[PDB]
Nucleic acid binder design. Structure first.
Lengths: 131, 136
RNA sequence: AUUAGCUAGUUGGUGAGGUAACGGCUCACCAAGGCGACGAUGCGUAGCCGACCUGAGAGGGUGAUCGGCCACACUGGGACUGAGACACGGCCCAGACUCCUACGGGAGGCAGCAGUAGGGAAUCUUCCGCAAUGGACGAAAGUCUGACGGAGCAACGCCGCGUGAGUGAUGAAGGUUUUCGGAUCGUAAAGCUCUGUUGUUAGGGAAGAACAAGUGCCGUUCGAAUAGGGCGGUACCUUGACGGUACCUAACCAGAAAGCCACGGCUAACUACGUGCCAGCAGCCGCGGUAAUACGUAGGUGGCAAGCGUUGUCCGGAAUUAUUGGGCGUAAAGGGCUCGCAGGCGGUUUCUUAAGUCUGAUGUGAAAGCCCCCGGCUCAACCGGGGAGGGUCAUUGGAAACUGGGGAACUUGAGUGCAGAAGAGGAGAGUGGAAUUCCACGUGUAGCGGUGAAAUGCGUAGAGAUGUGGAGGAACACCAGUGGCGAAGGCGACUCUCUGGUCUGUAACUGACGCUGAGGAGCGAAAGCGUGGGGAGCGAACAGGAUUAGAUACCCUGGUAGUCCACGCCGUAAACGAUGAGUGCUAAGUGUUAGGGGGUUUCCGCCCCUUAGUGCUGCAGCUAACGCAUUAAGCACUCCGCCUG
C-alpha cells in the first residue's frame, strides 16, 4: 500500500532521533537518494552510503551527533501530502525558522534547497520542512 | 479531517438566533404578510397590565407589561422605572433588553417615550428613564 | 436533498419562412433524443461590480451614496416613425383607480425637482442661476435646460475651533465629611494682568470668468479675382447665481456658551443619608429580609466631549466550523460488521509528453477608493499629481525533478502454484449419555413441599423417598484455559456428507494486478411478528399465599405467550477494545496457541534465531489526569463516517 514513499522515510529519520540510533535503512528510490545528499552536503549527516542490491536498493544514513547531547535534526515535516500539492512560487520561496532552517524544494532545474532555488529564481513543489 | 472529505460536504456553518425575535420582523397591510425589516425599535400598544413575581433567589414583585406591536405580535414587555405611568392603549417604544430574572420577558419599555413621562425626581441616570435636567 | 427525476419545439436533421445578424427563432416533415449525483428540475431568497466595513492574514458581512451595466416607467399586451426603443414626462388597447361631463363623452400616470398624504422607530427646502461645467438644436448670437451650479433643513457622521487665560494660599468664603484636630471640592474663585479665534461693529473686497460673439491684422486655403470667405494665429472689447459671501482690516467686552455616562469584580474611580426580599439594579458573575462601596439621593472622584449613553445590526476577540487554524478511550463524536460500482489516493527503474506546475515576454483587469510618495487648500478632514497593487486572465516562448498521460523493464506490495499444520467457522440428514418432569407398577407411611419467618399449593383416593420399565422435549458436564476460529453478531455432545477463509514453508509464476470506499447489496444475539410443527424443564402477563402503612415489587407454589424447528419479516442493543479499515517505523522483559530454522541429541529435552494472533509489567514520547505503551491513545500518510453547550 505504502501511500507515498517520502513520508515514511522522513519520520523514520525522526523516529530514530528519540532513540539515537547510529544507522538507518531506507529503500532508496531516485528522489530518496537525492534528498540524502542535500542533508549530507549541508550539515545534518555524518556520512551517507548507497547500497546496490537486487531487491530495490537500500540507502543508509550515519546520523550527525557532533556535540554532547544535542540532536542536529530536531524534527522533520512533510508538507506536500498526496492530495495537497503546496506549489510555492519563486517570488514567495518559503524560508523556515527565519534565519535558521531549510526547506527542500524540488524545482524544474533540479531538486534544490532554499538557496539554490532562491538565486536561480525558480519555484515549484515544496516537499518537506526541516528544523 | 481529510481533504476530499471536506470538499463534498463543506463546513456546515453555525447559525445563531438574534437577541430578540420580535424586533426583527415588520408588517405591511395590503401585502397581508410579515416582512423582514430588522428595525431596532417599535411602537406598541399595551393590553393587559398585571404584575407578577421574579423566579428565584430575588423575590420582589415586578411590573409585567403585555404590549402589542405594529407587526401584529403580542409580546409581554417590561416596565423599568420606579413606579409606572402607563395605562391601557398607550404609545410604548421598546428597546431590546434582556431580563434574566423574569421568565419570558425580553423587552424593556423605554421610559421616556412619546407617552411615558419620566420617573419622578431622578437626578442620576438622566438619559435613561426619560427625565429632563431638573433646573439649571 | 425534509426538492431525484425533469422537458415533446423539448431535443436532432432536412427544407421553408423570418430576423441587421446565427439559430426550433417560427412552421411543415423526419428522427428520438437532450438534461442529471460534478445536484438537473423545483422552491424560498436577492439587482450585479469596482468597491464599503472588519480581520494580523486566510476569510466573513454588506452592495447605501459616487462610477460601470442590465432591468422597470400605474398593472399587463401589442406596434408605429426614427441610425438606435418595444420609448420615464409618445400613440393604440384592456385591468384597477382618480377627475370632468349637459351621461352622449373624454382627459390623467411624481420610483423627474420640491412638497403633501400614507406607511413606519426615521430621513430635508414647494429657493435662486444657466456665471462655470455639460448636453439639445441652429451659420452664429442665442434659446432651452429641477443635468448641474449653489443657497436652505436635521449634531447624521467624520475632521477643525471654542466655552476664557496668566498670576494669585488665605488654603478665602461656602459645600461635603469627620475619630470634631481636620480633610477634600484648591489656585478652583476673588484680586491683579491679558488677547479677541469666534461673538459684536464698521470698512475693504477675490479667484471661480475661460470665453464665445464683433472687431484688428498675418499665415494658408479655395476663389473670375487684391470680390468674398474659410480655418490657424495674435490684438482690442465684453460676460457672476453663490455674494459684499468667503476673506482681510480696525474697534468692543470674561463678556455669548458643557454636558451626559460610570464609580463591588470584569474596569479607571467611594464615601454619607435614605432604604429593609419591599421599593429597585442587572451585559456577565450576581446585589437588598436593618450597618446596600452593586438600589435611590447627596458630596466627591473617574470616563469622554459638542456630545455621551442605551438600542438593533454586522465583523472581530470566537483557534467556539479550525485550509493557514481543532477533534473522536471515558469530556459532544467511530457507521454493528462486511462485499463493493462511482469518486479518492500509488511500489521501483527508464524513455517520452507538457495537462498540472515553474518562468519570461506581450495584451489587459477604466477612473475614483484602499496603499507608496509629493503638492494644494490657515493645518486637518478633504482635494490634486505620480506610482504600485489587484486576474485559479488570454496568447506566446522557455524549464523537465516531482504529479497527471503514453512506451518499456525490476519484484519487495498484493495474488497464484506447490508442500505442510491448526481449528466449538457455516449448512445439511442421522446418532447417543447422564439429568428434570410425566406416566405404569412394586416396595413403603405421614407428611413432604417451601421461607427471614410462614402460608398457599401436594397428601390416606397413598404423596415425598426408593426399584425397574415407558413416552417426550430441550440443554449438551468432565475437557474449559486473558484457550481455538469467524469481519461482526456468534459457534462448545458425537460421526458422516458439503463448504469458507486462516497461518507456515519457499520461489515455481504474475509484474503493482493494490488500499479505502458515499449511495447500493448481503449478514446481523435477545425480544417481537405471520403460517404451521413441537412444547420436559424454564417462564413475562395474570392468579394465589405472605411481606408491608401501600406491594400493581424482590420472596413464595403454580402458571399463558415464549424459548425450540422449518420458512418469511423486523434490522435494533453497553451490536464494547466505549479504540473506523490499511501501510511502515519506534527500548525491553514475559508467558501462552500454531509453525518453521539451528545447536549436542533418534530422543526426551534444553538453548537460540524466527512468522502469526494471544495476555500481563514496563522506556522514550503522547495524554487534562486515570491510563495507553511493537495488538498505541507514539511519530507520519492515504482514503469513509461522526461532533460543535
Amino acid at each position: 500500500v505504502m501511500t507515498d514513499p517520502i513520508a515514511d522515510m522522513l519520520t523514520r529519520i525522526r523516529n530514530a532521533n528519540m532513540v539515537r540510533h547510529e544507522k538507518l535503512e531506507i529503500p532508496a528510490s531516485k528522489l530518496k537518494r537525492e534528498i540524502a545528499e542535500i542533508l549530507k552536503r549541508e550539515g545534518f549527516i555524518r556520512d551517507v552510503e548507497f547500497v546496490e542490491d537486487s531487491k530495490q536498493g537500500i540507502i543508509r544514513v550515519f546520523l550527525k551527533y557532533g556535540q554532547n547531547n544535542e540532536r542536529v535534526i530536531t524534527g522533520l515535516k512533510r508538507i506536500s501530502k498526496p492530495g495537497l500539492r503546496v506549489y510555492a512560487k519563486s517570488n514567495e520561496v518559503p524560508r523556515v525558522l527565519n534565519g535558521l532552517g531549510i526547506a527542500i524544494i524540488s524545482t524544474s532545474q533540479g531538486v534544490l534547497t532554499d538557496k539554490e532555488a532562491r538565486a536561480k529564481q525558480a519555484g515549484g513543489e515544496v516537499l518537506a520542512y526541516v528544523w | 479531517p481529510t481533504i476530499n472529505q471536506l470538499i463534498r460536504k463543506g463546513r456546515v456553518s453555525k447559525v445563531e438566533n438574534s437577541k430578540s425575535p420580535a424586533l426583527n420582523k415588520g408588517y405591511n397591510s395590503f401585502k397581508k404578510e410579515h416582512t423582514n425589516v430588522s428595525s431596532p425599535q417599535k411602537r406598541g400598544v399595551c393590553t393587559r397590565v398585571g404584575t407578577m413575581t421574579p423566579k428565584k433567589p430575588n423575590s420582589a414583585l415586578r411590573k409585567y407589561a403585555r404590549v402589542r406591536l405594529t407587526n401584529g405580535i403580542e409580546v409581554t414587555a417590561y416596565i423599568p422605572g420606579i413606579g409606572h405611568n402607563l395605562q391601557e392603549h398607550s404609545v410604548v417604544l421598546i428597546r431590546g433588553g434582556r431580563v434574566k430574572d423574569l421568565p419570558g420577558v425580553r423587552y424593556h419599555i423605554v421610559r421616556g417615550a412619546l407617552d411615558t413621562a419620566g420617573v419622578e425626581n431622578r437626578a442620576q441616570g438622566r438619559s435613561k428613564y426619560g427625565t429632563k435636567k431638573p433646573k439649571a
